[PDB]
Design an enzyme around this catalytic site. Structure first.
Site, PDB file in Angstrom:
ATOM      1  N   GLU A  35      44.014  19.539  12.731  1.00 54.14           N
ATOM      2  CA  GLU A  35      43.012  20.010  13.679  1.00 54.14           C
ATOM      3  C   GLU A  35      42.482  21.359  13.246  1.00 54.14           C
ATOM      4  OE1 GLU A  35      41.537  18.586  16.180  1.00 54.14           O
ATOM      5  OE2 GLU A  35      42.847  16.857  16.411  1.00 54.14           O
ATOM      6  N   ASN A  46      30.209  21.274  19.086  1.00 44.78           N
ATOM      7  CA  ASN A  46      29.641  19.950  19.076  1.00 44.78           C
ATOM      8  C   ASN A  46      28.254  20.094  19.660  1.00 44.78           C
ATOM      9  OD1 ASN A  46      28.833  17.330  19.697  1.00 44.78           O
ATOM     10  ND2 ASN A  46      30.950  16.669  19.955  1.00 44.78           N
ATOM     11  N   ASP A  49      27.159  17.346  22.433  1.00 46.13           N
ATOM     12  CA  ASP A  49      27.483  17.469  23.842  1.00 46.13           C
ATOM     13  C   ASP A  49      27.653  18.899  24.313  1.00 46.13           C
ATOM     14  OD1 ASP A  49      30.002  18.381  23.071  1.00 46.13           O
ATOM     15  OD2 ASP A  49      31.062  16.647  23.873  1.00 46.13           O
ATOM     16  N   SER A  51      29.727  21.311  23.578  1.00 44.93           N
ATOM     17  CA  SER A  51      31.071  21.781  23.902  1.00 44.93           C
ATOM     18  C   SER A  51      31.713  22.252  22.602  1.00 44.93           C
ATOM     19  CB  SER A  51      31.916  20.669  24.523  1.00 44.93           C
ATOM     20  OG  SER A  51      32.392  19.776  23.527  1.00 44.93           O
ATOM     21  N   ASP A  53      35.559  23.177  20.519  1.00 41.80           N
ATOM     22  CA  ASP A  53      37.003  23.045  20.442  1.00 41.80           C
ATOM     23  C   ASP A  53      37.501  24.380  19.920  1.00 41.80           C
ATOM     24  OD1 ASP A  53      37.954  19.634  19.539  1.00 41.80           O
ATOM     25  OD2 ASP A  53      37.184  20.574  21.403  1.00 41.80           O
ATOM     26  N   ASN A  60      39.341  21.469  23.981  1.00 41.96           N
ATOM     27  CA  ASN A  60      37.949  21.371  24.425  1.00 41.96           C
ATOM     28  C   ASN A  60      37.499  22.184  25.656  1.00 41.96           C
ATOM     29  OD1 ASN A  60      35.561  19.543  25.775  1.00 41.96           O
ATOM     30  ND2 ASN A  60      35.400  19.653  23.547  1.00 41.96           N
TER      31      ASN A  60
HETATM   32  C1  LIG Z   1      38.704  15.762  23.293  1.00 47.96           C
HETATM   33  O1  LIG Z   1      37.631  15.206  24.030  1.00 47.96           O
HETATM   34  C2  LIG Z   1      38.056  14.042  24.748  1.00 47.96           C
HETATM   35  C3  LIG Z   1      36.807  13.367  25.276  1.00 47.96           C
HETATM   36  O2  LIG Z   1      35.998  12.902  24.201  1.00 47.96           O
HETATM   37  C4  LIG Z   1      39.090  14.443  25.802  1.00 47.96           C
HETATM   38  O3  LIG Z   1      39.567  13.270  26.483  1.00 47.96           O
HETATM   39  C5  LIG Z   1      39.293  13.163  27.829  1.00 47.96           C
HETATM   40  O4  LIG Z   1      40.075  14.154  28.516  1.00 47.96           O
HETATM   41  C6  LIG Z   1      39.883  14.088  29.936  1.00 47.96           C
HETATM   42  C7  LIG Z   1      40.662  15.229  30.556  1.00 47.96           C
HETATM   43  O5  LIG Z   1      40.430  15.295  31.955  1.00 47.96           O
HETATM   44  C8  LIG Z   1      40.301  12.713  30.454  1.00 47.96           C
HETATM   45  O6  LIG Z   1      41.679  12.479  30.172  1.00 47.96           O
HETATM   46  C9  LIG Z   1      39.490  11.627  29.787  1.00 47.96           C
HETATM   47  O7  LIG Z   1      39.984  10.364  30.198  1.00 47.96           O
HETATM   48  C10 LIG Z   1      39.682  11.757  28.288  1.00 47.96           C
HETATM   49  O8  LIG Z   1      38.897  10.788  27.613  1.00 47.96           O
HETATM   50  C11 LIG Z   1      40.279  15.140  25.143  1.00 47.96           C
HETATM   51  O9  LIG Z   1      41.135  15.636  26.160  1.00 47.96           O
HETATM   52  C12 LIG Z   1      39.792  16.280  24.220  1.00 47.96           C
HETATM   53  N1  LIG Z   1      40.868  16.769  23.371  1.00 47.96           N
HETATM   54  C13 LIG Z   1      41.204  18.054  23.376  1.00 47.96           C
HETATM   55  C14 LIG Z   1      42.308  18.488  22.435  1.00 47.96           C
HETATM   56  O10 LIG Z   1      40.695  18.849  24.153  1.00 47.96           O
END
Ligand SMILES: *[C@@H]1O[C@H](CO)[C@@H](O[C@@H]2O[C@H](CO)[C@H](O)[C@H](O)[C@H]2O)[C@H](O)[C@H]1NC(C)=O
Length: 130
Positions: A35, A46, A49, A51, A53, A60
């Site tokens: 990562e 990104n 969208d 946002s 990381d 995120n």
């Molecule tokens: C990366 O982005 C993901 C979305 O593309 C994100 O996943 C989402 O997280 C939400 C948290 O409330 C929820 O669980 C959604 O169902 C899920 O798809 C993921 O958490 C992100 N990863 C990081 C490391 O931030």
């Protein structure tokens, strides 16, 4: 700061990451490696969208930390995204533990899925004394 592999391994162990939510230290090590290359200053925007990381774990800004410029952000870790850019990872670690409490757990990091899932990751902690 760019951690050295074993330095990171021990730092993570000290912070209770080994076996946390059933996730081994080797798995955490493989994910931070892919990562961010162990860099706490890693930032990836990104444009699609709007946002970003942040940090060694690339968390995120839409869901976990707040950076004031991301549409629909929730800030579930209740931290400033800037807290994820410090050299001290206590904050990034407390937020990463929160991330895995989601239904998908560690699948939240696709780099884990692409490079860690179903592979031998014991090399990430070998020789670190953890
Ligand atoms: C990366 O982005 C993901 C979305 O593309 C994100 O996943 C989402 O997280 C939400 C948290 O409330 C929820 O669980 C959604 O169902 C899920 O798809 C993921 O958490 C992100 N990863 C990081 C490391 O931030």
């Amino acid at each position: 700061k760019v951690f050295e592999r074993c330095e990171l391994a021990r730092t993570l162990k000290r912070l209770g990451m080994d076996g946390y939510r059933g996730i081994s230290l080797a798995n955490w090590m493989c994910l931070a490696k892919w990562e961010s290359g162990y860099n706490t200053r890693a930032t990836n925007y990104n444009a699609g969208d709007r946002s970003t990381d942040y940090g060694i774990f690339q968390i995120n800004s839409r869901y976990w930390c707040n950076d004031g410029k991301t549409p629909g952000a929730v800030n579930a870790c209740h931290l400033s995204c800037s807290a994820l850019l410090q050299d001290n990872i206590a904050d990034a670690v407390a937020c990463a533990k929160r991330v895995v409490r989601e239904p998908q757990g560690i699948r939240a990091w696709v780099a884990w899925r692409n490079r860690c899932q179903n592979r031998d990751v014991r090399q990430y902690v070998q020789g670190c004394g953890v």
